[PDB]
Structure 1
Amino acid sequence: GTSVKPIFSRDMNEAKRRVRELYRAWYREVPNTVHLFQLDISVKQGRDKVREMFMKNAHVTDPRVVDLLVIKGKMELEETINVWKQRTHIMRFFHETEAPRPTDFLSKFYVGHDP
């Protein structure tokens, strides 16, 4: 029951199919992105980052949430392909000027009060 209306997919199988299609499109786009934006990363780095972004949301079990995630990923792909994005936008995925924040207890205790 729970009486919900879908966006595109009726169960997780169709949602997974759409996820795979979007992943294929991003995988094909990465080399062109590296060429056009004149990025100093490799194609391997770009595809690894695409996989990491996809795996960030691997725990989702709602087909509607997956449909919205695919819609957002398609929005980002359309944005990248048309060059609406600049090199700064593409490089924002890699956080190159962010100092690594530690995760163990002792370093956090040393730096400050935040957990």
Structure 2
Amino acid sequence: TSVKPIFSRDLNEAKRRVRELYRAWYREVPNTVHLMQLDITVKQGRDKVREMFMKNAHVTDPRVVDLLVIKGKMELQETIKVWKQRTHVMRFFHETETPRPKDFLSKFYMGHDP
């Protein structure tokens, strides 16, 4: 315990920042899908944003959250100030890779080490 605060004194204040970033991404998804001529649906993309913002829903510690948005903000900057081209963005969608089943029987049938 006894940790020093990075930018947010408590999960509460930190959550404020997450809200802002969500908004940012939400407002940006449409633009990217147009400035990058990505073949995705704005709605679809906006769900992806939600996915990511929740993939890390479990974090309880304020410090971890604060870094997470710093990093998140940095990603947005790379996508609104466009330095990240389609190949970079579409990677988020994991479009080419073949999905792996998580069913035990499925894995048994395919991989030595699951």
- TM-score tier, shorter chain, comes to over 0.9
| TM-superposed deviation, 1:23 | 0.4
**After the TM superposition, which parts of structure 1 deviate over 2 Å for at least 4 consecutive aligned residues?**
none
Deviations 1:46-68 (A, max 9, x none): 10000001010000000000000
Q: Percent identity?
A: 92
Q: Per residue, is there more helix in 1 or in 2?
A: 2
Question: Partner of 1:3 in structure 2?
Answer: 2
Unaligned ranges ≥5, structure 1: none
Deviations 1:88-115 (A, max 9, x none): 0000001111111011111101102121
Question: Partner of 1:46 in structure 2?
Answer: 45
Correspondence 1:50-89 to 2 at 5 A: 50-89=49-88
| TM-superposed deviation, 1:3 | 1.9
| TM-superposed deviation, 1:38 | 0.2
Instruction: Find the aligned partners of 1:54 and 1:114 in 2 and give their Cα distance.
Output: 30
Relative to the length of structure 2, the TM-score reads 0.97
Aligned-CA RMSD value: 0.7
| TM-superposed deviation, 1:11 | 0.6
Instruction: Find the aligned partners of 2:23 and 2:111 in 1 and give their Cα distance.
Output: 43
SS in structure 2 at match of 1:31 = helix
Relative to the length of structure 1, the TM-score reads 0.97
Deviations 1:12-39 (A, max 9, x none): 1101000000000000111111110001
| TM-superposed deviation, 1:82 | 0.9
Aligned pair count? Answer: 114
